Each structure stands twice: as C-alpha cells, then as structure tokens.
Design a protein around this ligand. Structure first.
Ligand SMILES: O=C(O)c1ccc(C(=O)OCCO)cc1
Ligand SMILES: [Ca+2]
Length: 560
C-alpha cells in the first residue's frame, strides 16, 4: 500500500490497521478529491484525501447526542506542515476545512499544500438545538460538552489529525500551525497555555480569552444604554437599538477623529495613537469639528450634537462593568473611528450590531441584549445553566445583578465540576514551555471590536511581558486601528498572518511589521490603502513625504 495514495486514504476508513490515539474514533468518510480549479472566491485546491468522522459519540445528561466531529484534508503533494483553523461563535458547525487563515485572504492553507483539520467543538447546531435552552447554545446543559467546547475537542482532533498524517505520509509533520479569530483566538491562546507542544505557531485574532465575562460586559452595556433608549419591544424592554441612530454614531466617530486622528502626525481617518486618544477624548466636552461647537447638546437634540443622556450612556458602557465595591469585572473599551464610518451611503454596522443592534427595527437584535452572546452567557457560561424562553433574554440582561450574577462564571454545581472560567478562559501568562520549545504567537485585534476589548488583549500582553521579560522574542501583538470584529471597518483589516508565522517558527525571523490593506478603502475615498501593522506598543508613523495610502511611506515606531 503506497503512501500519499488513493489506497492509503481509503485504508483509513474497518478491521484495517489505523491506530487512533482515542479508541472511540469513527471514520465516516475517506475520499480521494481531484485538484479543484481557482474560482472568483477561492484559490485552486490540490488533489487530496478527505477524512471526516467523530470522536467519543455518547449521550449527554440532557438526553441529546454528542460527538467531536472533525474533517481532515491531506494533499497528495504535501509541504510537511500541519494546520488547524479555529472556530467562531459557540462553534457547532463543521467547515469545509481547507484551512482559513482569516484576514480576508483568498488562499486557504490547503491551497499551499498544508494538511488541514477543523472541528465543530463537540456539538452540532443541527442536532443540539433545544428550543427550551435558547437554541444552538443548548450544549451548555451537558457538562462534558462544555469541557469539549473549552479545551478537549481541540486536543482530541489535533492528536487524531497528527496520527492520520503520520500513517498517510509515513512521517510526522515537521511543524504544526493553528490560526483562529474570536472564539478561534481563544482556542489559540488556550493551546499555548494548556497544550504547549500541540502547535509550533499560533495566530490568535481578537481572542475571547475571557469569553465568559462577555455576557457581564453585555448586561452592563445594555443597562448603560437603556436610559437613551426610545420606545419598548413586545416584552416591555427598552429598544437599545434606538439609543443611537447611524448618523449619531457617525458624529461620535467624527468627534473622535477631530481630537485623535492627528495625534500620529497625519490626518487620514485613522487613529494610530490609540493611547494618546484615550487620554485626550471625552464625549462630554469634545468639539464636533464641523460646526466648532460642543459635541454634547446644550439645548434640544439636533443632527449635529448628541444629548447628555446619550453621552452618559456611551461613557458608562465604554468604562466597563463594576460591582457595588467598584471592582472592574472585565475592562474598558477604546474610543476609535471604527465605531462608525461612511462608504458611499453605507453606514458601518460592524461596531453597533454588538451592543445596540439595527436602528431600523421594532425589536432588540443586539448580540449582547437578546442575541447569541447573551444566550451563550446564560446557558453555556453561568453554572448552573439558566435555560429560559428566547423572549425573556433581553429582560434578563436588564435585571442582571453585578454582585450575584458574575459569581456564576467562577462557580461549580452538581455535575458541572469545572467553572466556565476553568474550561473556557485562557488567562494564564505561563507560556515558558511554549516559548522554550520554539513556539511563536502572533496576536492581532481590531481597535473597534465590540465583541472583545482590544485594550483587554493589550493588558494580557502587558501581563505576559511582566511575567516573562523578553516576551517579544516569541509573542507579538498587532493592534489594528479602525478594524471591527476579526474584519471590517475603516482600517487595514486584511493581511497574510500565515507567511510571517511560518518565517518566525522556521527561520527565527520576528515580524517587525506585517503589511495590511483595507477591505473597504471606500471609507477613506481611495481605490487602495496599504499600511504596516506594528508590534505593540509601536504604531504606524508617516515618514514626512509620499502617498498616504502607500505602506513604504510608513515606519513602525514608539509613540511621540
Ligand atoms: O466570533 C467569535 C465570537 C464568539 C463568541 C462571542 C460572544 O460574545 O459570546 C459570549 C457570551 O459570554 C462573540 C464573538
Ligand atoms: Ca491619523
């Protein structure tokens, strides 16, 4: 049976000789795939072996079925590297598994002759959909499905993929790479902390390393925004979406650019000096730079000012949750131009969908008010889980208690033997074993992400530098001004993180910069804008002359 062959693939399927690290591995599919042509939306895919199946098929304490699904793609002609893509939301879907590299790239890892694997995280959105437990978050009712969503799925699938690669090619992967954003960023940080030898290079974008506190931020932003809300929904809950119109947010963005844009030495619609900007900008006293007057309404509301009740609300929301002792429960958020943005008539919805939701609606549709995020908190991250009908959820965020409810992400209860911060949190700065075997980590984060605070990622990185002096030799953070959650918004949101990760791990060449470019250069009225991403705490500084949309006219440097 020759290696890297149609027969080697088929043989992975019986009483055949394949030895899985987990004896409860079942292969459903082992198929040979012809090389696929490039399309408008994807690079050409090489000829490869597709293996799909499931690990640890079992019944939950909720009577639902559970398994850890995986999909593995092993090219006939292999570059010797193994690649795993991270998830998003609460997972539950099995992707095509060509190896997404994020940063809006056309190319998959499979398109570069990597072996590629993905998992659903140990539940299935089609089968683990419980109308009495808020839908696709229903996995949280099973304790093991929690541990699988947190850490165990990624572990079992990594071991199984590497075993499948070793058998199919008759040698082990020279190096292994993981790339994820959001929940996938949490997974990459979890891997560096709990499974240091699983991956040699990790890219962790907009990482939910404190994901169980998102619901607490969410409750807070909701309660903070309820006073500026106009009108009610069917259940009598204020319409958080009506707190700010798209034009209102655009004004907020224009006022932030007014005080902050030029602090990097260049008026360009981009706040490169995020730190000077947080020191300098207060919506209660800043100028609307169009009419020279206070951003905050002196009299009645107009198009060209925001009301006191609105300034109060957004300020309280961005400061972040505290309990009655005044202990911070998450973190504060960065003022940035990416809270809105204009391309043609189109208003950036990227920022507002998280806390406010769509202005144009009879109902609340915010992620953190009534959407997936608030539901996930109640069923997945609170112990014990609080299932309820979907229409009670927004009310529950309004009547959330910052002294009782936050304790529940630290709590254990009956069969829930680990807290959500135990199994989902990835807060450890003990990365010595990762560092010392030659592991490299690239973190990136959009400054205008409303899912997770770029400044919370930065504080993790400060705490990593303090615990492990010299940390920049193995881990670097690239903050992206303007960028929303993983993509979108008025910034250079597009980049190839994979090439510089491979260079760091294999050649020891640290990224002093990473080229990025805007997916919507409409926001700056140009056809193209390219800029260096800079390693924290460095920022992009214009050299003094040249086209402002060209990366060669920018250096990475310390802030003034
Ligand atoms: O994408 C990714 C992503 C994954 C999860 C969330 C979230 O907020 O739910 C958490 C409730 O504490 C947001 C973005
Ligand atoms: Ca600027």
């Amino acid at each position: 049976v020759p290696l890297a062959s149609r027969a080697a693939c088929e043989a992975l399927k019986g009483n055949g000789d394949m030895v899985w690290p987990n004896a409860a591995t079942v292969v459903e599919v082992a198929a040979w795939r012809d090389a696929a042509p490039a399309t408008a939306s994807a690079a050409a895919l090489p000829e490869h072996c597709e293996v799909s199946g499931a690990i640890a098929k079992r019944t939950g304490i909720d009577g639902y079925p559970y398994e850890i699904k995986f999909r593995l793609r092993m090219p006939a002609e292999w570059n010797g590297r193994f690649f795993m893509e991270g998830g998003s939301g609460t997972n539950g879907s099995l992707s095509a598994a060509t190896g997404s590299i994020g940063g809006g790239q056309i190319a998959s890892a499979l398109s570069r002759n990597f072996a590629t694997i993905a998992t659903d995280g140990g539940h299935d959105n089609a089968v683990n959909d419980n109308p009495d437990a808020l839908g696709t978050v229903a996995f949280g009712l099973d304790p093991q499905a929690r541990l699988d969503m947190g850490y165990n799925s990624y572990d079992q699938v990594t071991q199984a993929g590497k075993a499948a690669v070793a058998r199919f090619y008759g040698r082990a992967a020279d190096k292994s790479y993981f790339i994820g954003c959001s929940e996938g960023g949490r997974e990459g940080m979890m891997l560096s902390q709990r499974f240091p030898s699983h991956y040699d290079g990790i890219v962790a974008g907009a990482p939910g390393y404190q994901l169980p506190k998102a619901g607490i931020s969410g409750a807070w932003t909701t309660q903070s925004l309820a006073p500026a809300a106009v009108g009610l929904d069917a259940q009598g809950v204020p319409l958080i979406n009506k707190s700010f119109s798209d034009a209102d947010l655009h004004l907020l963005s224009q006022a932030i650019l007014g005080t902050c844009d030029a602090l990097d030495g260049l008026a360009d619609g981009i706040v490169d000096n995020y730190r000077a900007c947080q020191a300098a900008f207060d919506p209660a006293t800043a100028a609307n730079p169009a009419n020279g007057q206070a951003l905050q309404c002196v009299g009645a509301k107009t198009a060209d000012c925001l009301s006191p009740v609105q300034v109060t609300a957004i300020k309280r929301a961005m400061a972040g949750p505290v309990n009655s002792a005044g202990t911070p429960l998450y973190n504060r958020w960065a003022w940035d131009a990416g809270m809105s943005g204009l391309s043609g008539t189109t208003y950036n919805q990227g920022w507002r969908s998280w806390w406010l939701g769509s202005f144009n609606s009879s109902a609340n549709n915010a992620q953190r008010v009534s959407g997936f995020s608030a539901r996930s908190w109640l069923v997945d991250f609170a112990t014990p889980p609080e299932p309820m009908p979907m229409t009670q959820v927004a009310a529950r965020m309004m009547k959330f208690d910052f002294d009782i409810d936050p304790l529940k992400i630290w709590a254990t209860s009956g069969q829930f033997t680990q807290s959500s911060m135990d199994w989902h949190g990835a807060t450890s700065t003990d990365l010595a074993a990762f560092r010392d075997r030659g592991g490299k980590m690239i973190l990136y984060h959009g400054m205008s992400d409303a899912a997770f605070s770029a400044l919370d990622t930065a504080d993790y990185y400060e705490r990593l530098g303090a615990a492990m002096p010299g940390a920049a030799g193995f881990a670097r953070l690239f903050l992206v001004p303007g960028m929303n959650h993983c993509s979108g918004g008025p910034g250079t949101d597009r980049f190839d993180m994979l090439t510089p990760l491979v260079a760091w791990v294999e050649r020891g060449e640290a990224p002093d910069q990473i080229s990025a470019w805007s997916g919507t250069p409409g926001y700056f009225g140009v056809a193209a804008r390219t800029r260096p991403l800079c390693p924290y705490p460095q920022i992009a500084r214009y050299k003094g002359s040249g086209d402002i949309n060209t990366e060669a006219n920018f250096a990475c440097a310390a802030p003034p």
